[PDB]
Design a protein around this nucleic acid. Structure first.
Ligand SMILES: [Zn+2]
Ligand SMILES: [Zn+2]
Lengths: 527, 527
DNA sequence: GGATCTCGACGCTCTCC
DNA sequence: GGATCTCGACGCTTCC
C-alpha cells in the first residue's frame, strides 16, 4: 500500500498524537509524510523514510516514543548529532538519555537501571552502532527490557551508512541486523536524506527486514529563491559584485558563501574583511578552536557571513540564514541541494545564488578524478548551470526522479524571454580540427590553450588556418565548449603531475557522430 | 551706440522689411542681431556682424538689397559659397547673379548692362576679390553704377580673410580697401563667424573704414545637447557602442561622425557598412566625383551618416542633422563648435557627442606642431573634455569670452552627482621620478611607456622602485596624466622622424612648484 | 622609431570531508 | 607541467 492510505487521523492513537504534537512539541501541524510515517510506526510496522535534511525526520520517532510505555531506541553515528537532539528534547521537557564512549560510570549505571526500571520515564535512548556490536552488557539490558515489554521501538538514524554505495558508510552498521533478529516484535524506523533505491534495498537486507514501506518526501523548499549568475573573470570585480548584495538586499542579514578550496575561503574572507564585511572562514585544516569561534559568532549574528568549504555543514541548524552564495559550483546536485538547503530554515524567503565559472569545471573535474562517477556528477551540475529556460525546481526533481508549482521562485521562471535552438555544429567541427592538429603535433591542450587558438590567439603552431572565432564575448565561448564537453563530443583527459591533477581536452566519444555531415548540434539561446 | 538701440521696428523701412521677410524670404521672425544689423545697413552705416555659421548672416545684406534702389554688391572667396546662395535665391524668385573666372562672355556682357540699366531689377551681384583687383572693366561699370545711384551697398563675406591672424587668409582681400575709398556713399557690411578683435581691428584698416559698428551674436544654439563620453580602447567595441546609438535613439535620423584622419574615416565607414549602417566616407584626398556622390545621397537621406574629416564642412546647410558624433576630439574649441554646430539647423532637438580618448591628444598634438598656438588650442579642448561639473555651455562661453541658461541640455547639467577635490600630488612626484630616471638613462618615453612603467609594466629598466600605481582603471590614469600635461607639470617633446612626428612626455615648466614639499595638486571627482 | 607579435625564458603555486 | 613575465626578433602602420 501507499502513503495516502496513512494520511489519516482515523487511528486509535490519532488523539494522543495530534495532542502530543500540539502541546509537547509545540508544533501546530504535520509536514508532508510526517503524519503517514507516524501512523505506520504506531501501527507497529517497518518503514523507511527518505526526506531532505532539516525536513523534520526526528519528530517521526520521538513522538511515538512518547505515545508508548518505556523507550524508543535510537541508533545514531555521531555524538554531535545525538547531542543536537537531546538539547532539543531536554528543552521540551522530554526524558531522553544517550550513551557514549566517554560516558560516565554513574550515568551508564543509571541508564541500565532505567531500561528495566518499569517506572522509568526515560522515553528515548540514543546510542552508537559500536554499542550494539561491542557491548554484551547493553545487549542483555535490551533483552530484559524487550521481555518486560518496555522496549517496543527501534530508530536507526542515517540508515544509508549501511551500504557500500552510501557515501557515509560505517562498518558497525552491518552488525545492526541483529536487532530485528532478536527483537522481531520491536518495530523499526530507518531515516535518511541521501537514499538511492539500491542503498535502501541494501539497508533493508543488512537490517534483516521484509516487508517494508518506503516513503519519499519531496525535495522542495518553497521559500527558497534559486538563481545562477555568470561568474566574473576578474576576481576583484567578483568581490565588488558580492559586497553590493550583502550591503544592498542583504543588509544586516545572516548568510553563507561556499568555496571550492581552503585557499579560496581564506582569500575571499580577507578580501571582504578589507571592504567592511563581518566575514569568517571555515575549512577542515582550521584549528578546531577556530572552527568553533566562527560558529558561535555567526549563530549570534556578530559575524554576518561564513566563508566556508563543504566542511561547514554537519550539524548546522541556524534558522535565519537569508542567503547562501556559491562562489564556485558544488561537486554535485546532491551537494548543491544540501549545501543551499541550509538557507531559510525559518521558512521565510531566502536567496540561493550560484556563480558559474568555466574554469571551475576543471579544478573540480581534476579533483574528483578518483571518484567513479565524480565526473558524471560534475557534468550534471554543469548542465544545471547551463540551463536558461527550465525552472530550477523542475531540474532538481528530474534528479530525484520525482513526480514534478514554482511560483516565480527561481530566475528562469521570472524571465519573460523567449528562446530558440541555435546550431553550433561548425564551432565543434572547428574545435576538433584544432585538437586533431595538436595530437599530430603531440601537443596537449589545456582548456585555456584551446580557447586561445580558437580566438586566433595563443601559440601560433596551435592555430588552424581558416578557423575564425565569432565576435561573441568570452563567456559565450566558454559556454559553447562546456557544452561539447558534457555532451562528450569533447572529453577531459587528466594528467597527474608532481603536485597537481590537471585537465586537458580531447576529442570525445561522440565526435564520431559528426562523421554524419548532416549532423546537427544545437544550443538553446534567448530570442 | 549698442545693438539694443537698433532692436527697433521704428524706421521708415521697417514695414517694408517685415513684409519682405515674411512674404519674400518666407521667414516669420528675426534671429538675434538680424534686425539690428539690417537697420544699421539700411541707415547706410558701416557694420561688422560676428555670428555663428548657419546663424543667418546672409539675410542681413540680401534683404536690404531688396529694400533699396539698384543692387547690392557681394564679395565672396569661393565659387561654391556663391553658388550656394544663388540656388537659394533662384528658389526664392530673387534676381541675383554672379561673376566668375570661368564666366561666359555672353553672361559677362549681360551683367554690365544690368548694372547701369536704370530699370534693372537685378538686386545682388556676387564676385571674387580677384575681380576687384584684376578687372579694369568691372570697376568702371561699378563707377558708372555708383554714379547712377544704382549701387548703394557692399557685402564682404568672410571678412576675416583680410588678416594675418584669420585662418583662411586670402591675399586678394588686401586690395578691397579701394571700395570705400572710391565709393564712400555705398554702405559696407562685413560678415564672418571667425572673428578676433585683432582680426577685426585689421579688416577695418584694410577696408579703409572708420567709424564702424560691431555686432556679436551669441554662440548659443538652445536645441543642441552637449555630451562627452569616454572613448573605448577597443576599436571594435567602439564601433559596437556607436551602432547601438544609431539603431537606437537615432533610428532613421540623419547625422555626422567626425574623425581625426582620412584613414579613420575610411575604416569606420567600412566597419559600419559591414554592420548594416548606410555610412559614407568623406576626406580631402577623395576623388571629387566621390566627394560629390556622398553629399547628394546624404542630403537626400539615402545615406544616414557621413563619416568625415574636417574636409566635410564648408557649405553644409542641411537642416535635419539630428546628431554629430566626434570619433576623435577636434583641434580647438573653435573647430568643435563649428563642427558640432552643423547639427540641428532646423532648431529642433539634436545631439552632440564627443568621444574623448587619451591617445588622441598626441595624434592631434603631433600634427599641429607647426601651428604657433596649436598646442594651446588643443589643451583648451582637452580641458573641456576633462570637465565633469561645469555646464558645457558655461565652458564654451568662457572661450568666446562672452557674457554668459542651459536647461539640462548638457551631460553635466543633467548629473545629480556631487564632487570634491582629490589630491593627486604624489602621483605626479611618482611620474617625475620615472621621467628623471628615463633621461638619466638617455631614454625617451612615449606616453604609452610612461603609463606602463607607472603601472609596473613595460621594460623593467624603465620602472622605479617603490612606485606603485593605484588600483584605478586605466582610463583614470590617462586622465591624471592628461591633467598634469595641460597644467604643464608635464610637457610634450616632439621628435621628427623619416615619416612622422611623434610625441614624448617630459617634465614641464611647472614641475618646479613641487620643490615646495607642501605643494598640492588636486583634481575634481564625483562624491 | 613606436608598437603589436612570437619565441624560448625564468618565476611561482600545486583541489574537499 | 601550466600561466605569467621578460626579451630582443622582424614586419607593419597625421586635417582644411
Ligand atoms: Zn521556477
Ligand atoms: Zn549645461
Amino acid at each position: 500500500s501507499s502513503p495516502a492510505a496513512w494520511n489519516k487521523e482515523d487511528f486509535p492513537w490519532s488523539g494522543k498524537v495530534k495532542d502530543i504534537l500540539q502541546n509537547v512539541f509545540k508544533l501546530e501541524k504535520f509536514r508532508p509524510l510526517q503524519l503517514e510515517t507516524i501512523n505506520v510506526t504506531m501501527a507497529g510496522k517497518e518503514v523507511f523514510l527518505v526526506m531532505p535534511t532539516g525536513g523534520g525526520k526526528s519528530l517521526c520517532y520521538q513522538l511515538p516514543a512518547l505515545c508508548s510505555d518505556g523507550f524508543t531506541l535510537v541508533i545514531c553515528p555521531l555524538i554531535s548529532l545525538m547531542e543536537d537532539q537531546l538539547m532539543v528534547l531536554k528543552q521540551l521537557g522530554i526524558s531522553a538519555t544517550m550513551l557514549n564512549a566517554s560516558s560516565s560510570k554513574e550515568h551508564v549505571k543509571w541508564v541500565h537501571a532505567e531500561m528495566v526500571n518499569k517506572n522509568s520515564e526515560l522515553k528515548l535512548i540514543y546510542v552508537t552502532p559500536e554499542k550494539i556490536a561491542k557491548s554484551k552488557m547493553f545487549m542483555s539490558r535490551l533483552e530484559k527490557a524487550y521481555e518486560a515489554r518496555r522496549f517496543t521501538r527501534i530508530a536507526v538514524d542515517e540508515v544509508h551508512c549501511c551500504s557500500q554505495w552510501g557515501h557515509d558508510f560505517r562498518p558497525d552498521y552491518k552488525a545492526l541486523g541483529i536487532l530485528k533478529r532478536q527483537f522481531p516484535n520491536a518495530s523499526l524506523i530507518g531515516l535518511t536524506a541521501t537514499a538511492t533505491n539500491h542503498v535502501l534495498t541494501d539497508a533493508q537486507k543488512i537490517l534483516c527486514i521484509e516487508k517494508c514501506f518506503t516513503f519519499t518526501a519531496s525535495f522542495n523548499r518553497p521559500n527558497l529563491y534559486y538563481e545562477v549568475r555568470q561568474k566574473p573573470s576578474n576576481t576583484e570585480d567578483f568581490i565588488e559584485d558580492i559586497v553590493k548584495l550583502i550591503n544592498g538586499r542583504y543588509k544586516g542579514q545572516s548568510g553563507i558563501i561556499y568555496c571550492f578550496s581552503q585557499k579560496d575561503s581564506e582569500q575571499v574572507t580577507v578580501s571582504l574583511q578589507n571592504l567592511g564585511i563581518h566575514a569568517g572562514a571555515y575549512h577542515a585544516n582550521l584549528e578546531p578552536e577556530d572552527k568553533t569561534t566562527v560558529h558561535r559568532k555567526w549563530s549570534a549574528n556578530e559575524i554576518q557571513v561564513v566563508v566556508a568549504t563543504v566542511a561547514f555543514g554537519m550539524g548546522i541548524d541556524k534558522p535565519d540564514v537569508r542567503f547562501v552564495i556559491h562562489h564556485s559550483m558544488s561537486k554535485s546536485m546532491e551537494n548543491y541541494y544540501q549545501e543551499s538547503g541550509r538557507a531559510g530554515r525559518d521558512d521565510m524567503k531566502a536567496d540561493c545564488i550560484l556563480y558559474y565559472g568555466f574554469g571551475d569545471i576543471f579544478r573540480i573535474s581534476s579533483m574528483v578524478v578518483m571518484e567513479n562517477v565524480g565526473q558524471q556528477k560534475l557534468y550534471e551540475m554543469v548542465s544545471y548551470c547551463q540551463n536558461i529556460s527550465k525552472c530550477r525546481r523542475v531540474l532538481m526533481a528530474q534528479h530525484f526522479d520525482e513526480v514534478w508549482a514554482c511560483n516565480k521562485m527561481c530566475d528562469n521562471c521570472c524571465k519573460d524571454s523567449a528562446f530558440e535552438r541555435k546550431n553550433i555544429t561548425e564551432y565543434c567541427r572547428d574545435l576538433i580540427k584544432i585538437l586533431k592538429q595538436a595530437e599530430e603535433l603531440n601537443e596537449k591542450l589545456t582548456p585555456l590553450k584551446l580557447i586561445d587558438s580558437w580566438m586566433g590567439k595563443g601559440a601560433a603552431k596551435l592555430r588552424v588556418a581558416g578557423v575564425v572565432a565569432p565576435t561573441l564575448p568570452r563567456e559565450d565561448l566558454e559556454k559553447i565548449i562546456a557544452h561539447f564537453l558534457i555532451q562528450q563530443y569533447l572529453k577531459e583527459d587528466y594528467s597527474f603531475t608532481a603536485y597537481a591533477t590537471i585537465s586537458y581536452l580531447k576529442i570525445g566519444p561522440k565526435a564520431n557522430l559528426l562523421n554524419n555531415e548532416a549532423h546537427a548540434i544545437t544550443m538553446q539561446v534567448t530570442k
